[PDB]
Amino acid sequence: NKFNKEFQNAIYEILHLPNLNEEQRNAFFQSLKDDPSQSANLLAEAKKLNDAQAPK
Amino acid sequence: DNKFNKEFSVAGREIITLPNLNDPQKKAFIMSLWDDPSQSANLLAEAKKLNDAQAPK
């Protein structure tokens, strides 16, 4: 538990989300590295993107 | 030194979809991989052996 909870959760959940493409995942991970304070914003963004990309 | 190494996404997706790991195991492998993605082959081999050892019987 040395990591910030929101940081670790964003990494795990962005890896877990099934409807992100690979480029989107990699972009979220680079953004997390760029600015870890943005972890909760980035997770919320990734979840909205995931839900917008469910197969029809 | 802050560039993201996309090897993390590839090996990370392989670990996180191993069906028999528990959540603490997945999370610890993933954070180890995040800290050094160059270790992907070693971590995947460890994770896959654990996944087998914990397969349903």
Residue numbers in the entry:
A (entry chain A): 3 to 58
B (entry chain B): 2 to 58
What does the paper say about this structure?
We next generated libraries at the interface of a weakly associating dimer (Z+ ZSPA-1) with micromolar affinity to determine if we could affinity-mature the interface by coevolution. To clarify these inter-residue co-variations discovered from the sequence data, we determined crystal structures of 10 coevolved pairs that spanned a range of cross-reactivities and orthogonalities (5 from LL1 and 5 from LL2).
The first library, LL1, was designed to use minimal codon sets encoding both polar and hydrophobic amino acids (F, L, I, K, H, N, Q, and Y) for five positions on the Z domain and hydrophobic amino acids (F, L, I, V, and M) for four positions on the affibody ZSPA-1. Phe13B of the Z domain, which is a core residue of the central hydrophobic patch in the original dimer, was mutated to the smaller Ile or Val in both LL1 and LL2 library mutants, and this was compensated by mutation of the opposing residue Leu9A to the larger Phe.
